Design a protein around this ligand. Sequence first.
Ligand SMILES: [Cl-]
Length: 225
Amino acid sequence: MSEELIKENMHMKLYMEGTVDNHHFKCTSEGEGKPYEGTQTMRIKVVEGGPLPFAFDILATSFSKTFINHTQGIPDFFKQSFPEGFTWERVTTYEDGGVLTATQDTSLQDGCLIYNVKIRGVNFTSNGPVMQKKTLGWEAFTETLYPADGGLEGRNDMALKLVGGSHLIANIKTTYRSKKPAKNLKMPGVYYVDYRLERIKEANNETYVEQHEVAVARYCDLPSK
Ligand SMILES: [Cl-]
């Protein structure tokens, strides 16, 4: 491919810290996946602030765009960015008021993918399902990506499962920026990424979490005209 530095099997290391409401936390994680098959596993330790007084679910989407299977010859903005790497900035707005901003740096060091994530969430109400930890993982979802603001932008709603069977919806806005100059990049048009983010295991009040993701990029295959 274009992306020779990105192998069929890749390891990753992640550093995460920040705050939700008045609550500081810090996590580390390590994992591996298959970047061209669109699959990955992450093993996460909460190392400061644990056990967290909020649903770990609100952090889950912040643990990896190199591991998307780009089908149908869709140009791969993330894989093309290496060795330089890329960043993202995101805001997630929960329909019951919580707002979580996240920024991430993605680099490649000696064959390993290194993530640095900073999180700041505010206005999660004490009585809500997040702060009361009444959440049960996300439904499968699809990101829409399109070229904008000198990079890629992403958009999508997501549905958080709650105990009792109902859902809490969040709307997500992301901006992705390559550290490689845009003249060295084959830019995609509008495309879609199908996601399934699943919790595999949790130990000690969500102090240890294993997470799995499958991600497949595609066009819309509906008949046209
Ligand atoms: Cl959507």
